[PDB]
């Protein structure tokens, strides 16, 4: 009874990173070696473990977070990083055990003229704690003059569009990301390797 | 939340909003310059309007942060670039009129044809057809025809357009609190907040005139030496004491004298230090030229070109399926998209131009991580200098023999040495009077110092006096000869190539000292020196984040432009020329004329 990784890795549409999607995985067999080799991923980095080691392991749940960001930002989907994405959109914990996977999605997510449907959060009054998700639309107040829900001087809407044009350099192209967390609770392991 | 902190955030907003609007304008321009059509003119106009309206809104906000309350230097520099409202201080009519004028001139320039008189439909474009005549023909009358046809049948179209361009551009400049467009252009060199590193727009004119005084003797003697050589190339046509006729100088304007090397080579029996023939025998094509320039850069520790550079650049003529502007340009579109537009031919000229244009790209790549408003050369002269530093090395016989364009037992003489210096002078020293004079004319026109019915009068007066060059045919004020040159009709500043030419030697001195080079500056080739690569890069990666006077001092130890390194590169040739000329006239009378 194999795990529905396809639904996640091969979805036609991906979330914006400000509103990243989490899929719970459970009660299924998961071959993490076939995953590592199922495509060419630009990034496949595991932190508390290794892939061959995971087929020897059982977990209560696996969580698959997915979103799109710029290439030059995939380095932020790692513990201890800082910057716009790790600070304001998606924060891995320092003690993170799990895998970060990413691949180039220029051919799916760019458009002549540019695709602007993917957003990121530009401003926040403080940093997300790990795995929090902020879909707020409040105007960011860069000062003490209050904004009252409108953009203006020292008053900025916090969500901005990536622009993905097929001709951008690699750092500016869209990359699709999947983050796998492995949860072990005082309950039966329901997702295992062979 | 200090003012500085509020401005920091505002600029954070700006950089992210700006990136796409700028990139879309770049793409629109790219289509036009690679494929001239009314539809692409309209799209370019639309994308540039969007960009300018964005800039206008953004600048008026930026000026709400008083610079007086700002200590961060690099913050102050970004808000200084938004201190003027730009091109949108012109009414909609005037702005659409100005764009029409700019597009028409650029279209006329890269699209206009003159037809042969013997063949009323064997038409020729400037590039390649006319340029080839002007680089290779040894016939007074053919060269006179191409030089006169271009200016008569195309330059005349540009005359009334250029007139209104001046009027409109000066209004734009006056609205931005400059005296005229020419003052506006000179602002590229202004530095204000930094003590002991300031530089005013008036000091540029002074430093260019003062520095030019020290170049005259070298030029006087190079002038006198080619003029004696041309006497035998064009029997009957050269006065021994006169200016050189402008159609005999080796290109359409005499901007460079390089193509006169085959007529002025000091030592002709020696191996050819002009590798054009050698690279045709070896089946080199454009790709080989650009892959070789790429090898040169990674040899000093800098990157490959990007894949997008190779897939999207235009490195050869597209053929007649498109109408393109072939003038070599290095494009930084944004978002890590870098391209060169060039109609490369298999010639040492284009070989070296390939290295120089790539040099500018290399600069663009090195400061891509700087904040948007500081993604720029320290000044326009810096940005035009990097490439030329590179070609100084790439042109040396040592380098040319190592990439296999001279025999592996090629031997260097005091004579091959003089051949090389002579050819280098034809290009580098030849262009300086040409470059100074052209901008002086434009500065004067912008300042309102030349009544319109004296434009071509004063132009040729200035040619005869500063440049030693005379028109072969009298020209009416129906002509607009300055506009027959790309940069004038494509609205680019020109003094960059003056200051650039002094910088490039100041820099080469410092790079060669880094690479531990042994003897005189013209035998230096920085290939394979990562210590030289590194010293260069640490200046490239800064962009405009430091005032150019400090950026310069950090590399060469002088906070100002300096002519001595160029003079000393050429000292060996200077003493030779002075000996060569001991029996010839040196200097020129401005009264003689090819026509009477
Ligand atoms: C995604 O689709 C391809 C093609 O059907 C398939 O071979 C691949 O294994 C899929 N990836 C995953 C992780 O299921
Ligand atoms: C040139 O531009 C036109 C639109 O003005 C376009 O339809 C055509 O495909 C372009 N040609 C090339 C080679 O890009
Ligand atoms: C543009 O600049 C001028 C002069 O600084 C200023 O008065 C004006 O308010 C700015 N904005 C607009 C839309 O003109
Ligand atoms: C200038 O500001 C930048 C941040 O914008 C800072 O990193 C840098 O150290 C500052 N230097 C000075 C002289 O203000
Ligand atoms: C060093 O330069 C020489 C030519 O001077 C060239 O033949 C050689 O391949 C270069 N070496 C490296 C490691 O680039």
CATH topology of the largest domain in chain B: Neurolysin, domain 3
Instruction: Please estimate the helix content of chain A.
Output: 10-25%
The number of helical segments of chain B is 24
- Summarize the amount of helix of chain B as a percent range: 55-70%
Q: Determine and state the CATH class of chain A.
A: Alpha Beta
Largest sheet of chain B: 2 strands, antiparallel
Structure, described:
Chain A: This is Spike protein S1. Chain A: Residues 1-194 are annotated as: Receptor-binding domain (RBD). Chain A: Disulfide bonds join 3-28, 46-99, 58-192, 147-155. Chain A: Residues 70-72 are annotated as: Integrin-binding motif. Chain A: Residues 104-175 are annotated as: Receptor-binding motif. The complex is a heterodimer of chains A (194) and B (596). By secondary structure, chain A is an alpha+beta fold. Chain A has one domain (5-120, 161-192): Alpha-Beta Plaits (2-Layer Sandwich). Helix content of chain A is 12%, strand content 27%. Chain A has 5 helices and 12 strands. Chain A has helices at residues 5-9, 32-36, 51-54, 84-88, 106-109; strands at 21-25, 28-29, 43-46, 58-59, 61-70, 98-104, 119-121, 140-141, 155-156, 159-161, 174-183, 191-192. In chain A, the strands form 4 sheets. Chain A has a 5-stranded antiparallel sheet. Chain A has a 3-stranded mixed sheet with strand order 2-12-4, with no helix packed on it. The longest helix of chain A is centred in the N-terminal third of the chain and has 5 residues, at 5-9. Chain A is globular and about 60 Å long. Chain A starts with a helix and ends with a strand. Chain B has 596 residues and is mainly alpha-helical. Chain B folds into 2 domains: 1-89; 210-583, Neurolysin, domain 3 (Orthogonal Bundle), CATH 1.10.1370. In chain B, 58% of the residues lie in helices and 4% in strands. Chain B contains 24 helices and 6 strands. Chain B has helices at 3-34, 38-62, 73-81, 92-111, 126-136, 140-175, 181-186, 201-213, 216-233, 261-264, 276-281, 286-298, 307-312, 348-366, 380-394, 397-402, 414-447, 455-467, 486-489, 496-514, 530-540, 548-556, 564-569, 571-580; strands spanning 113-115, 123-125, 244-245, 329-334, 337-341, 469-470. In chain B, the strands form 3 sheets. A two-stranded antiparallel ribbon of chain B has the order 1-2. In chain B, strand 1 and strand 2 form a beta hairpin. Chain B is globular, with a radius of gyration of 24 Å. Chain B starts with a helix and ends in a 16-residue tail after the last helix. The A-B interface holds A 113-114, 116, 122-123, 142-144, 153-154, 156, 160-161, 163, 165, 167-172 and B 1, 5-6, 9-10, 12-13, 16-17, 19-20, 23-24, 27, 61, 64, 306-308, 312, 333, 335-338. Bound molecules: 2-acetamido-2-deoxy-beta-D-glucopyranose (NAG) (5 copies). Residues 8, 71-75 of chain B line the site of one 2-acetamido-2-deoxy-beta-D-glucopyranose.
């Amino acid at each position: 009874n194999l795990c529905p990784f396809g639904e996640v890795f091969n979805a036609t549409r991906f979330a914006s990173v400000y509103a990243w999607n989490r899929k719970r995985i459970s009660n299924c067999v998961a071959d993490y070696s076939v995953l590592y080799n199922s495509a060419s991923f630009s990034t496949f980095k595991c932190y508390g473990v290794s892939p061959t080691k995971l087929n020897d392991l059982c977990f209560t749940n696996v969580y698959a977070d997915s979103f799109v960001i710029r290439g030059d930002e995939v380095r932020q989907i790692a513990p201890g990083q800082t910057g716009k994405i790790a600070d304001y959109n998606y924060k891995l914990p320092d003690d993170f055990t799990g895998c970060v996977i990413a691949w180039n999605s220029n051919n799916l997510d760019s458009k002549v003229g540019g695709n602007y449907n993917y957003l990121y959060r530009l401003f926040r009054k403080s940093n997300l704690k790990p795995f929090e998700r902020d879909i707020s639309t409040e105007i960011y107040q860069a000062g003490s003059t209050p904004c009252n829900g409108v953009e203006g001087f020292n008053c900025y809407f916090p969500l901005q569009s990536y622009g993905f044009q097929p001709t951008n350099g690699v750092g500016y192209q869209p990359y699709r990301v999947v983050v796998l967390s492995f949860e072990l609770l005082h309950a039966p392991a329901t997702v295992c390797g062979p | 939340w200090t003012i500085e902190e509020q401005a920091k955030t505002f600029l954070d907003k700006f950089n992210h909003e700006a990136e796409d609007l700028f990139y879309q304008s770049s793409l629109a321009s790219w289509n036009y310059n690679t494929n001239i059509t009314e539809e692409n003119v309209q799209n370019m106009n639309n994308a540039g309007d969007k960009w300018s309206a964005f800039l206008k809104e953004q600048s008026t906000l930026a000026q709400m942060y008083p610079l007086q309350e700002i200590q961060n230097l690099t913050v102050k520099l970004q808000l200084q670039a938004l201190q003027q409202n730009g091109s949108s201080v012109l009414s909609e009519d005037k702005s659409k009129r100005l764009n029409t004028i700019l597009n028409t001139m650029s279209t006329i320039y890269s699209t206009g044809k003159v037809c042969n008189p013997d063949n009323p439909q064997e038409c020729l474009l400037l590039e390649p057809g006319l340029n080839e005549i002007m680089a290779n023909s040894l016939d007074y009358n053919e060269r006179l025809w191409a030089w006169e046809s271009w200016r008569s049948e195309v330059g005349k179209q540009l005359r009334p357009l250029y007139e209104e361009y001046v009027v409109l551009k000066n209004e734009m400049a006056r609205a931005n609190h400059y005296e005229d467009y020419g003052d506006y252009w000179r602002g590229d060199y202004e530095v204000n907040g930094v003590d002991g590193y300031d530089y005013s727009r008036g000091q540029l004119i002074e430093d260019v005139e003062h520095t030019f005084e020290e170049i005259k003797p070298l030029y006087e003697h190079l002038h006198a030496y080619v003029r004696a050589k041309l006497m035998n190339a064009y029997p009957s046509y050269i006065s021994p004491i006169g200016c050189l006729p402008a159609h005999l100088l080796g290109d359409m304007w005499g901007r460079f004298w390089t193509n006169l090397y085959s007529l002025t080579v000091p030592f002709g029996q020696k191996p050819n230090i002009d590798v054009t023939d050698a690279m045709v025998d070896q089946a080199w094509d454009a790709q080989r030229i650009f892959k070789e320039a790429e090898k040169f850069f990674v040899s000093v520790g800098l990157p490959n070109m990007t894949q997008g550079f190779w897939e999207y650049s235009m490195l050869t003529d597209p053929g007649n399926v498109q109408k393109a502007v072939c003038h070599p340009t290095a494009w930084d579109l944004g978002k890590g998209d870098f391209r060169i537009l060039m109609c490369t031919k298999v010639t040492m000229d284009d070989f070296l131009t390939a290295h120089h244009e790539m040099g500018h790209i290399q600069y663009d790549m090195a400061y891509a991580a700087q904040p948007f408003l500081l993604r720029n050369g320290a000044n326009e002269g810096f940005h035009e200098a990097v490439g030329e530093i590179m070609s100084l090395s790439a042109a040396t016989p040592k380098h040319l023999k190592s990439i296999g364009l001279l025999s592996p037992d090629f031997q260097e003489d005091n004579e091959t040495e003089i051949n090389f210096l002579l050819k280098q002078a034809l290009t580098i020293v030849g262009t300086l009077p040409f470059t100074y004079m052209l901008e002086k004319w434009r500065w004067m026109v912008f300042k309102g110092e030349i009544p319109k019915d004296q434009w071509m009068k004063k132009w040729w007066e200035m040619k005869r006096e500063i440049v030693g060059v005379v028109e072969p045919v009298p020209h009416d004020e129906t002509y607009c000869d300055p506009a027959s040159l790309f940069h004038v009709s494509n609205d680019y500043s020109f003094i960059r190539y003056y200051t650039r030419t002094l910088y490039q030697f100041q820099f080469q001195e410092a790079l060669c000292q880094a690479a531990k080079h042994e003897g005189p500056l013209h035998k230096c080739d920085i290939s394979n020196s990562t210590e030289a690569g590194q010293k260069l890069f640490n200046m490239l990666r800064l962009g405009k984040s430091e005032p150019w006077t400090l950026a310069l001092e950090n590399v060469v130890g002088a906070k100002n432009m300096n002519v001595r390194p160029l003079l000393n590169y050429f000292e060996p040739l200077f003493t030779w020329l002075k000996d060569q000329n001991k029996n010839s006239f040196v200097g020129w009378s401005t009264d003689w004329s090819p026509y009477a």
